[PDB]
Structure 1
């Protein structure tokens, strides 16, 4: 595996978005991952619709602005046979009735999705070396909330209360990190991103290795 990976450097990451006052993070993480594999597979970067997932992807466990799961996100895109664009189905940070017309417009498709084996930073690194990966982590703590720069090494718990997207990894001064794309806008962290410690073992830093998944496209 490479020592450094950054999917932003090859145009596979859409500019930072902001989920606003809505617990839709699962949807932003789902979309960032799908956007990434689409560019990597097809060669074209397209910004995709979080709102569609919020409005049309409700399940028993996925509940619009009241939280949800990236696996349910991926399931929707597979089951629907695709996802519409950000421009066509814009984000309003509010739950709305599923727009059937816009649900029927499919600009990007995925073939499958896979879960990263739990508590396994090596399997996670393997996945990130090929594409962005959806993850959930413990983001509730003061220090995480007020992160502005550097490599985040905690403190944080391991509850998976907030979804983000790993868009790469690297090392500086012997300290390994993941590059994480958050959906709190450009004013949090390193213009919307965080470097968070990697190779700490177990569930990973803030539980980042607990619930990782990614969308699959068969051909490159």
Structure 2
């Protein structure tokens, strides 16, 4: 595999967003992954609708601002036959009624989605070498929350309480890292991103390798 991957450098990453006062992180992670594979397969970067997932992708497990699962995000897009744009169905950071007309406007679609084999950074690296990957990690700790620069090495737990998107990886000073796109806006971390330690084994740093998945498009 390549020694360095950065999906931002090839225009497969939309500018950093902010989920605000809403636990919709699962939706931002879904969308950032979908945005990435669309660019990769079609050559066009389109910013897509998190609100649509919040409002229209409710399941038994996925509940708008009260948390959810990227797998439910991908399923909704598959089942719906696509997703509308950010501009057409803008983000409000509150759970609203599903706008059926906007739900019927489909600008980007995916064919399927896949789970990365759990607790396998090598398999995660393989997936990331090909596209951005949706992951969940433990982001509630003081240090994760106040991260502003460098490579994050903890401390953190391993409960997957917050979804983000891996948009790359590399090495600096002999330390391997993942590049993580967060949805806490540009004032957190390295203008919204975090470099977090890679190749630590097991569940990955802050449990990053526990619940990884990515959307699939058959044709390039």
TM over 0.5: yes
Please list the CA deviations of residues 41-75 of structure 1 after superposition, one character each: whole Å capped at 9, or x if unmatched: 00000000000000000000000000000000000
1:218 aligns to what?
218
User: What TM-score results when the alignment is normalised by the length of structure 2?
Assistant: 1.00
Question: Which secondary structure state, in structure 2, belongs to the residue aligned with residue 129 of structure 1?
Answer: helix
Following the alignment from structure 2 to structure 1, what is the Cα–Cα distance between the partners of residues 162 and 99?
A: 27
1:10-61: CA deviation from partner (whole Å, max 9, x where unpaired): 0000000000000000000000000000000000000000000000000000
RMSD: 0.2
CA-to-aligned-CA distance 1:100-155 (integer Å, 9 cap, x gap): 00000000000000000000000000000000000000000000000000000000
Q: Residue in 2 aligned with 1:73? A: 73
1:196 and 1:135 map into 2 onto residues whose CA distance is: 13
Partner Cα separation in structure 2 for residue 218 and residue 148 of structure 1: 38
Distance 2:216 2:198 in 1: 24
Displacement of 1:218 in angstroms is 1.0
Instruction: Supply the distance in 2 between the matched residues of 1:171 and 1:216 (Cα, whole angstroms).
Output: 27
Distance 1:51 1:38 in 2: 19
Quick one: distance in 2 between partners of 1:69 and 1:174? 34
Deviations 1:66-90 (A, max 9, x none): 0000000000000000000000000
* Runs of 4+ with deviation above 4 angstroms: none
Unmatched segments (≥5 aa) in structure 2: none
Distance 2:41 2:219 in 1: 6
Kindly state the Cα deviation for residue 176 of structure 1 after the two structures are TM-superposed. 0.1
Give ranges in structure 1 of 5+ residues lacking alignment.
none
Q: Distance in 1 between matches of 2:199 and 2:216?
A: 25
Q: 1:219, CA displacement in angstroms?
A: 1.4
Give the total of aligned pairs: 220
Matched residue, 1:38: 38
Q: Secondary structure at the match of 1:166?
A: strand
